[PDB]
Amino acid sequence: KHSLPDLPYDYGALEPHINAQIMQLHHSKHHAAYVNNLNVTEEKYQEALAKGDVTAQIALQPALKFNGGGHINHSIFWTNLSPNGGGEPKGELLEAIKRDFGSFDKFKEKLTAASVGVQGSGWGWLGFNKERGHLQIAACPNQDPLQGTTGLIPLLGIDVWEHAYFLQYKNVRPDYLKAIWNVINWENVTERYMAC
Amino acid sequence: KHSLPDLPYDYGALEPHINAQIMQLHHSKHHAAYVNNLNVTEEKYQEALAKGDVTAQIALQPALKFNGGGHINHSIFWTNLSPNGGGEPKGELLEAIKRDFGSFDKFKEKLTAASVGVQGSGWGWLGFNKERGHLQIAACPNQDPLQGTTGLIPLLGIDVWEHAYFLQYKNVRPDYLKAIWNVINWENVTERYMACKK
Amino acid sequence: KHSLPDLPYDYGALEPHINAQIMQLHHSKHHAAYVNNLNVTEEKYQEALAKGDVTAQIALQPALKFNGGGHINHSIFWTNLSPNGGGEPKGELLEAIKRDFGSFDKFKEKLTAASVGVQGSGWGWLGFNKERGHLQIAACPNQDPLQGTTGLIPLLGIDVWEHAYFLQYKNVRPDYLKAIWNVINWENVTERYMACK
Amino acid sequence: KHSLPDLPYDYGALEPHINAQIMQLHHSKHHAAYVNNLNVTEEKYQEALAKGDVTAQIALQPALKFNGGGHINHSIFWTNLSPNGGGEPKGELLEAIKRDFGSFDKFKEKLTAASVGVQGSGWGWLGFNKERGHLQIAACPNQDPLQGTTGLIPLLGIDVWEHAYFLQYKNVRPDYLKAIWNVINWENVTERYMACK
Ligand SMILES: [Mn+2]
Ligand SMILES: [Mn+2]
Ligand SMILES: [Mn+2]
Ligand SMILES: [Mn+2]
């Protein structure tokens, strides 16, 4: 069974950048529902597959991608944030960002733009392209996960579903983006980088 | 020149079903943004058209559908709600709902399902299929408008973007859908329905 | 584990409406590859499932829908054609078609239009809407199958991938559509329809 | 008003790699239809735009992208081929390919894989990313054009619609991909590349 991961910090730990009510709902209600529905969905697919019921498998794909995507994406996101975060990364990851995007600040502008550019629900990502051996920014719709739908290894995700910011920032998504840099866990992003 | 239409009522007219903060933000910020981006996008398209720049015409399509669709969808949505709304339609529209969906309550179950079923942002619609001469439910992603993308004539729209309910109902989209039945402007939906039969 | 069905007729049986070469390639090569890749993908998806590898499950979805759908769609399509086909259906099916589309000619017009209307590869379908209790026309892209992606029960499918007609009709998909009416197996479409009720 | 560009060579100029029948049909009928439908759609769009009819504009988007894209893609494609082509590109373009893909052969493997991997109709592209200042491989579905939908500047396109190869190669798209390398117009790809610096 899939389980809702524990957060690495308390619901209020990312204040004032992301408030406690957003965090609490996001984790204990939103992501919990993805986990719960992915478990059901995986079970039904196992049944369909055992019968070679191809129609049923195909019909189940939206719930698997959405709930499974949601689980993947939110599990990464929590590890990407920290009450002890913010600042800039160091070492090879910082040099990679400079190599690939010109500078840390240009990188932030491009990931901000990809994140602000999502029309509707979705995610902005910093990923690693294994075949090209460099960093790459991508946007993903709804809960479509980065690696599963594009092959890029996720390093840093920014959730731009309205539930992730509306209570606090209302429709002003760029304000949310500006604030989240203050809580990025660059230590985590660097581990993800070094692992691929 | 497209313009932001005034609401037919004050921001707090739909309380307690849809609160005044949702309404004020929804209209004065969200829809407002779509109107201006629509106008600007249209003017960019006229420039691209005049030069036969097909690449630029295609690059502008996401903004035109998103902002155009948003203007269309929200313009209908406000007219679909009323402080004097709720209850059931009468006449031909109710008999069509019965013939097409079995009963009013079954219709509600089916538009609720369509609306709850949207994964991500989008809209639940009751539409009219002009070719088949009957009612039809459909869901649309993001701001993709009903008639522009499916051919169905919009009768009643239910906005299920999180901005439409999160401040009040948080993740619980079904509680928002339960509530909104209390403020549907069946007079407007009936007007839209009869225009299909004129 | 899935396998390639035999055609109900010989490769040349639908001449002159759909030539022999088109049929032979379409069944022995195209559909065969969907079956083979379907088995391969199901086998990968069970390993992924067993390990809770959700990323791998999602990465396999395009192949499962494409090859899965291909096997589903082609399998129905062969049974929907016949050398003894054509004309128009009878009884309850014909009554529904008049009821839902006006008349048989209007129906043909509508399914033709939906088929001609696919931009790129895909299929036009006459289906049954179980919830509404009536016939419904839909188009599906690529190999996306009708029931698995829309819930409609397939009754008659028209393949408008270029491999289904190009050898013979080149780009003129309307000529193909006109011709295929001559080989529609209405006894099969009827059977599929009665089974929905 | 858009027009069908003449080919830079005769219809049998790319024999035996792409046969004359495919070329003639592809240019004189398939591309010509996109030209016509683009003109019509543009004029309908201008009428819609002049009336403030946003529903009408949005309903025309699929025909504009499909036919407009089809015009863009095929116009590039004819210029990307040559009877005097093949081999490896001369100049900076090869050095860029080696930098971005390792070697020419790995580049051919990657564009081949992107092209073979299109499920249904579409295009494989070698593009240039202006933001990153390097080459990038991308696949596009149907006639969605590279620049208009991804921002990448097209350098080399490989049409993998079935009309582009079925008459000759039947379902064996990889055979077509192998053959087309013999007729790439590197002089034209290089012109498009230098235009990106
Ligand atoms: Mn989220
Ligand atoms: Mn809205
Ligand atoms: Mn086929
Ligand atoms: Mn082509």
Side-chain angles (χ1 to χ4, degrees):
Chain A
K1 289 93 67 170
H2 301 278
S3 287
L4 180 71
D6 294 324
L7 293 190
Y9 37 82
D10 259 338
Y11 290 136
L14 308 184
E15 295 277 10
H17 310 292
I18 308 163
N19 75 28
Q21 189 176 21
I22 288 158
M23 297 291 313
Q24 178 148 17
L25 289 158
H26 206 173
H27 173 77
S28 78
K29 302 298 177 153
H30 208 86
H31 182 182
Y34 294 137
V35 170
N36 297 336
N37 295 148
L38 163 69
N39 279 327
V40 174
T41 291
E42 282 200 342
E43 173 165 298
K44 296 292 160 206
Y45 196 104
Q46 185 50 227
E47 305 185 336
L49 190 62
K51 307 171 290 150
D53 188 340
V54 178
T55 287
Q57 284 170 67
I58 294 174
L60 284 165
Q61 291 183 339
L64 195 282
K65 175 170 82 170
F66 189 61
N67 292 299
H71 186 218
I72 294 151
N73 300 335
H74 288 91
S75 300
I76 295 164
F77 192 53
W78 310 134
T79 70
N80 280 170
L81 310 176
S82 197
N84 295 341
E88 310 196 357
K90 246 71 232 135
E92 291 177 53
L93 171 63
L94 173 65
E95 298 302 305
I97 285 167
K98 285 149 129 184
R99 177 186 303 108
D100 288 339
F101 300 108
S103 69
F104 188 69
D105 282 355
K106 292 173 165 303
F107 151 72
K108 271 199 298 172
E109 220 187 327
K110 291 138 198 189
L111 183 50
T112 296
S115 298
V116 167
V118 172
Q119 299 170 334
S121 304
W123 288 76
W125 293 95
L126 168 74
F128 189 72
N129 192 144
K130 292 177 288 180
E131 105 186 339
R132 295 288 299 270
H134 61 215
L135 301 170
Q136 186 166 338
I137 285 164
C140 294
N142 304 138
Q143 296 303 347
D144 293 15
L146 187 69
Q147 190 181 166
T149 58
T150 73
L152 299 177
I153 308 311
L155 303 177
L156 173 61
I158 306 207
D159 190 356
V160 292
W161 285 56
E162 284 168 338
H163 61 246
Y165 61 89
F166 198 85
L167 285 176
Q168 183 175 357
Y169 296 104
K170 322 292 189 292
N171 296 282
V172 189
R173 198 191 292 174
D175 280 353
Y176 168 60
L177 259 285
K178 187 266 108 174
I180 200 166
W181 299 107
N182 295 293
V183 282
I184 304 311
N185 186 347
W186 283 113
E187 159 179 290
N188 179 262
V189 184
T190 297
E191 289 162 4
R192 295 181 174 278
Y193 172 82
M194 294 299 184
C196 63
Chain B
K1 254 148 268 245
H2 301 274
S3 70
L4 179 72
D6 284 349
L7 296 176
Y9 38 77
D10 294 346
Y11 292 131
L14 308 188
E15 301 266 17
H17 308 294
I18 306 172
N19 84 21
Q21 189 176 204
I22 291 180
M23 296 299 296
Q24 185 171 3
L25 289 164
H26 203 178
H27 182 255
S28 76
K29 302 306 187 287
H30 209 84
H31 189 182
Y34 292 135
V35 176
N36 191 231
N37 295 156
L38 169 56
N39 281 325
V40 167
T41 297
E42 278 193 342
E43 286 180 67
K44 291 179 168 240
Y45 208 104
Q46 185 65 60
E47 305 186 323
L49 217 27
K51 310 187 308 89
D53 183 343
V54 184
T55 283
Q57 292 182 55
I58 293 166
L60 291 164
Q61 280 182 351
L64 195 285
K65 178 167 60 154
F66 188 61
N67 296 283
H71 178 44
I72 291 155
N73 300 338
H74 291 85
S75 294
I76 295 166
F77 192 48
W78 311 131
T79 65
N80 284 165
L81 309 169
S82 196
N84 297 325
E88 308 197 354
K90 307 186 151 57
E92 287 188 22
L93 172 55
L94 177 79
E95 289 315 317
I97 280 164
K98 289 161 162 181
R99 88 169 50 97
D100 291 340
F101 303 115
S103 64
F104 185 71
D105 290 342
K106 289 169 170 182
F107 151 76
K108 280 164 65 174
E109 290 174 338
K110 295 163 172 153
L111 183 56
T112 298
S115 298
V116 158
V118 175
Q119 299 168 154
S121 307
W123 286 78
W125 291 95
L126 177 64
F128 193 78
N129 187 148
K130 294 299 278 301
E131 158 213 334
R132 295 287 297 264
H134 64 215
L135 295 176
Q136 189 167 332
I137 289 164
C140 298
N142 299 321
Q143 298 301 344
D144 288 27
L146 189 73
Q147 182 176 175
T149 63
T150 58
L152 300 177
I153 307 300
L155 298 187
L156 170 66
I158 312 306
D159 187 356
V160 290
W161 287 55
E162 284 172 335
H163 64 245
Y165 61 92
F166 204 87
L167 277 169
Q168 182 172 354
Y169 298 99
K170 281 82 166 131
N171 42 308
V172 199
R173 196 186 297 170
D175 282 358
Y176 164 58
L177 253 293
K178 189 153 158 184
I180 204 178
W181 294 115
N182 299 108
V183 292
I184 306 303
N185 189 344
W186 285 112
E187 191 164 77
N188 175 266
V189 182
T190 296
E191 292 172 355
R192 292 173 177 287
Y193 171 75
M194 296 304 282
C196 291
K197 295 182 77 161
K198 66 192 198 174
Chain C
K1 211 176 162 96
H2 311 277
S3 70
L4 182 72
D6 301 325
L7 287 196
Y9 38 88
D10 302 344
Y11 285 137
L14 310 192
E15 302 268 11
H17 309 294
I18 303 177
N19 77 29
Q21 180 169 202
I22 293 186
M23 298 300 302
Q24 182 177 293
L25 292 166
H26 201 179
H27 171 255
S28 76
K29 305 296 179 268
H30 215 88
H31 190 184
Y34 295 135
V35 178
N36 298 340
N37 292 345
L38 170 54
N39 285 321
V40 166
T41 304
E42 275 188 353
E43 185 162 309
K44 307 165 166 182
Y45 201 108
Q46 189 37 53
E47 332 194 332
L49 201 39
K51 323 186 269 230
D53 185 347
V54 182
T55 289
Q57 286 173 64
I58 292 172
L60 290 164
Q61 287 183 346
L64 196 279
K65 186 165 57 164
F66 186 64
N67 300 105
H71 176 42
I72 295 162
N73 300 336
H74 286 88
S75 288
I76 296 155
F77 190 53
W78 310 130
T79 67
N80 285 166
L81 310 167
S82 177
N84 328 138
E88 62 160 75
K90 230 22 261 156
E92 287 183 59
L93 173 53
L94 177 72
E95 284 197 325
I97 283 165
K98 292 154 144 179
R99 173 197 319 144
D100 301 338
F101 303 106
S103 62
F104 182 76
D105 277 359
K106 293 174 230 196
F107 157 68
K108 275 160 91 188
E109 149 191 297
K110 288 173 189 147
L111 185 50
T112 293
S115 302
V116 164
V118 172
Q119 298 176 336
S121 308
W123 290 78
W125 290 98
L126 171 66
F128 192 76
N129 184 320
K130 277 185 313 200
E131 175 210 85
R132 297 287 297 262
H134 59 211
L135 298 169
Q136 187 168 329
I137 282 165
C140 306
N142 304 314
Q143 291 303 342
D144 287 20
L146 186 72
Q147 188 180 170
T149 63
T150 67
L152 302 180
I153 311 309
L155 309 179
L156 174 62
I158 315 298
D159 187 356
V160 293
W161 285 55
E162 293 176 324
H163 63 251
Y165 64 84
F166 199 91
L167 290 180
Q168 184 173 351
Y169 296 101
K170 304 185 191 157
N171 298 282
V172 191
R173 198 200 290 178
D175 288 355
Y176 167 59
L177 245 302
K178 189 171 175 126
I180 199 165
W181 290 113
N182 296 294
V183 292
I184 305 306
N185 182 183
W186 286 112
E187 179 211 33
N188 178 262
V189 180
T190 291
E191 273 160 14
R192 283 173 191 283
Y193 167 70
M194 294 304 269
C196 289
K197 324 183 73 203
Chain D
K1 152 144 281 222
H2 305 273
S3 61
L4 176 76
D6 302 320
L7 297 177
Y9 34 82
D10 296 333
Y11 287 139
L14 307 186
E15 299 278 8
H17 310 295
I18 301 173
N19 79 17
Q21 189 184 20
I22 286 168
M23 299 299 299
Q24 164 160 206
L25 286 170
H26 204 178
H27 172 263
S28 74
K29 306 302 198 186
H30 198 86
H31 188 358
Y34 292 135
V35 172
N36 183 55
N37 291 335
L38 168 61
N39 283 325
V40 171
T41 299
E42 269 189 351
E43 172 184 350
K44 285 186 151 204
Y45 198 101
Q46 171 73 69
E47 287 159 3
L49 185 57
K51 268 166 82 108
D53 194 336
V54 181
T55 287
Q57 291 173 66
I58 290 170
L60 285 157
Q61 287 189 329
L64 196 282
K65 181 169 69 171
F66 185 62
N67 296 289
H71 181 42
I72 294 154
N73 304 332
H74 287 82
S75 294
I76 294 163
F77 191 55
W78 308 137
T79 72
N80 288 167
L81 316 168
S82 177
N84 315 313
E88 305 189 359
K90 301 170 166 60
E92 193 175 317
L93 176 66
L94 179 68
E95 301 313 295
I97 287 171
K98 296 158 164 185
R99 172 192 70 206
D100 293 339
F101 307 105
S103 40
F104 181 70
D105 281 3
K106 239 150 91 206
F107 152 76
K108 294 198 297 185
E109 266 154 24
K110 297 305 179 56
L111 186 50
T112 300
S115 297
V116 169
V118 168
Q119 294 173 345
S121 309
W123 294 73
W125 291 98
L126 175 64
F128 189 81
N129 191 320
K130 280 170 110 176
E131 277 64 48
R132 299 279 305 264
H134 59 218
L135 303 168
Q136 180 164 339
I137 286 172
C140 302
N142 304 136
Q143 296 301 343
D144 290 17
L146 188 67
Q147 195 184 159
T149 63
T150 69
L152 304 180
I153 312 295
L155 304 186
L156 175 60
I158 310 306
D159 182 1
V160 293
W161 286 56
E162 290 176 327
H163 64 250
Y165 58 89
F166 204 79
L167 274 173
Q168 178 171 359
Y169 294 101
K170 290 65 187 230
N171 287 294
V172 198
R173 195 192 292 175
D175 280 7
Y176 168 58
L177 259 293
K178 207 208 183 67
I180 199 167
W181 296 108
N182 293 107
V183 297
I184 302 311
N185 189 349
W186 300 116
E187 153 185 305
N188 176 88
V189 183
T190 281
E191 279 172 45
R192 296 173 163 288
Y193 173 75
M194 295 295 292
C196 290
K197 311 193 93 217

